[PDB]
Ligand SMILES: *S(=O)(=O)C(C)(C)C(=O)NCc1cn(Cc2ccc(Cl)cc2)nn1
């Protein structure tokens with residue numbers, strides 16, 4: 067997250083860190099959202115490389131023991147069957163990870179609330195991106211979870227020629243684009259939390275940013291629109 071602020075420890079308890087094994091240790095690669103005690107929602111592109119993954123829930127500072135983390139293996143990966151790693155712009159950038167064990171819920175570990183199927187946010191709706199991704203274009207990961215206020219940019223604006231054009235689809239949510247605040251590498255897979263009827267719900271899964279930089283005017287961060295996939299999510303959970 068570029069242009070973010072450090073999140074309070076208990077603010078976003080559904081946020082997870084998706085990590086892969088690197089030598090004798092682990093490296094953060096993506097965010098995700100805990101949606102059941104044994105299921106995480108992330109981006110399909112986060113699992114394009116065949117690596118050993120783990121999920122960390124209750125995480126705040128990646129480099130330090132917070133006394134709140136639970137570490138769990140990934141037992142099954144279900145990518146959307148229409149996902150094409152060579153065509154991110156086509157959409158379908160969503161995957162479900164079945165965890166090897168059910169995590170325990172507490173003030174630091176809670177299920178993310180998903181939107182009602184079909185919900186589309188009005189332009190300029192209030193949302194926050196969270197993650198440990200880069201804090202500057204070409205920079206380094208955040209040590210502590212960051213948040214940034216990223217109001218939505220509706221489809222008509224986002225898919226217009228001076229924004230993303232045809233690359234953005236109606237199955238995506240755009241947010242931000244103010245040139246200062248944005249998602250960045252390593253936020254992918256994580257949530258966009260949007261305030262609807264007084265409750266925050268996870269309306270986006272971070273999918274891509276501009277090749278030209280993370281915080282670029284009129285290149286808002288682009289997210290998979292969770293409300294386009296409610297039936298798919300429920301079908302996966304019920305059949306696995
Ligand atoms: S996201 O918008 O943050 C973005 C820019 C697409 C991103 O940085 N995604 C992170 C990501 C994760 N993976 C899979 C991967 C590749 C290589 C290695 Cl060593 C581990 C994991 N690809 N992009």
Ligand code: NA
Pocket residue numbers: 125126127128129130131132135
């Ligand atoms: Na920690």
